[PDB]
Write a protein that binds this ligand. Sequence first.
Ligand SMILES: C[C@H]1O[C@H](O[C@H]2[C@H](O)[C@@H](O)[C@@H](O[C@H]3[C@H](O)[C@@H](O)[C@H](O)O[C@@H]3CO)O[C@@H]2CO)[C@H](O)[C@@H](O)[C@@H]1N[C@H]1C=C(CO)[C@@H](O)[C@H](O)[C@H]1O
Length: 486
Amino acid sequence: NVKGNYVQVYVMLPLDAVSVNNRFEKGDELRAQLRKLVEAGVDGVMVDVWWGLVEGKGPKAYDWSAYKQLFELVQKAGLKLQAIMSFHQCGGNVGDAVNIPIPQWVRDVGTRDPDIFYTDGHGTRNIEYLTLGVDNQPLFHGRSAVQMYADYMTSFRENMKEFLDAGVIVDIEVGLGPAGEMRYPSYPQSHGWSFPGIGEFICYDKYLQADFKAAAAAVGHPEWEFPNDVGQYNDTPERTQFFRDNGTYLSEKGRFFLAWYSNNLIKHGDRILDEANKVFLGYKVQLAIKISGIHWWYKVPSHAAELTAGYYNLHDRDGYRTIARMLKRHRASINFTCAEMRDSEQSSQAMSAPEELVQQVLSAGWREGLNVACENALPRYDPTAYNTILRNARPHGINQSGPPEHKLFGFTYLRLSNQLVEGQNYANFKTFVDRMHANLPRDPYVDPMAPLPRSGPEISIEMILQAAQPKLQPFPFQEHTDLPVG
Ligand SMILES: C[C@H]1O[C@H](O[C@H]2[C@H](O)[C@@H](O)[C@@H](O[C@H]3[C@H](O)[C@@H](O)[C@H](O)O[C@@H]3CO)O[C@@H]2CO)[C@H](O)[C@@H](O)[C@@H]1N[C@H]1C=C(CO)[C@@H](O)[C@H](O)[C@H]1O
């Protein structure tokens, strides 16, 4: 009896599932594509629910018409649905086809207060998301950013109640930064960064500067400032005194700054998840966050790119198990990425270890008792990619007589297109879904959700940080799946 081995597979819809004009205009094409996904046994789909589309008119002027039409189509296809609360810009990089900013009336606040945006040491404003520094600042016609997020989720719940009650919507992923990820915009690809640069610390908005000054004063160092030996976006670690081997990241001041920077991200997630949990209390849904997969520089001591993204991860400090501990009271899950990547596929100069990073994040989640899901980072259609995902989905392989010791709660494939559902690409994908399901048919009843309970007691940052050390080895992962595509 191998049923406990089944891993659900979701497919991300196109970024244009709803048009840039907040109209549902590609229903027939989507219906035809969904027939191919149903033919393949897919459990469900996932979609960005764009803040800039729905609350684009003005404050509280929510227009759910297009999303309700999409959700009805998905329901009528017999598929489940994962919904992302997408509080960020879609696109805006060179060559991006689908471009959806956050609401214009929100951005208008930035004309008199440009510090609503994450800002780098050059002064450059990132306009994709509101700084965590304004989470609780009532700058937006009397509302704070957290209040806008809570109010959007409340309207979503009210409008989409029928889909919740029908068991269509099964997961709410709460966007927490650029690209919906709980991170800083430290690698701005169309604006001065190229892979595999170390990135930069994006903490120069006036709200975050004042927060650092207060934190530094509370520990008797009012004179401390952000590190000034950190180089720039496209440096490598040895170009800098901060990130080099034996560099100033190790110093008392460096540790204080890196803790402050990464803790603020953790506090940002905790406060927004608390509000999301209040909204969805009693509904049979999973709440999730998305952690970005910063695999470059993972092999060097400073983990420089993780540091600048906000993940304070070192040989002897688990910067993901802290995040996981924060999620525990919410019963929130981690949605990770890079599940398709092998280390051998990465360039040598990137000092990149996606396999080890995946193992670390999955192991951290599992040690805190969380559900963990994953995505692929980059487009892949080939058997090797599917077999790498399969390894990560069941790291110990098939248990012949019950549930395995560890397994992903789900996998979401990025992303549906016409190219996926034809030819050899489609053949490879269908076989992948079979293998993820342990060669069983689709189970519409799998992984039922209890009504969401209220978050447990708020725990302090000090309590969260107990998870950082000692750093533990990951659980053992097989080198290759025992159930390959063939
Ligand atoms: C930002 C991004 O940087 C790196 O990705 C590289 C690829 O390694 C490189 O091969 C090339 O990718 C192209 C790909 O090969 C091709 O098949 C596809 O059709 O087009 C791709 C784009 O040109 O270029 C990219 C970009 O330099 C890393 O290897 C990626 O892991 C990395 N992704 C980031 C970004 C985000 C968004 O916040 C996270 O979701 C993700 O986890 C993170 O790793």
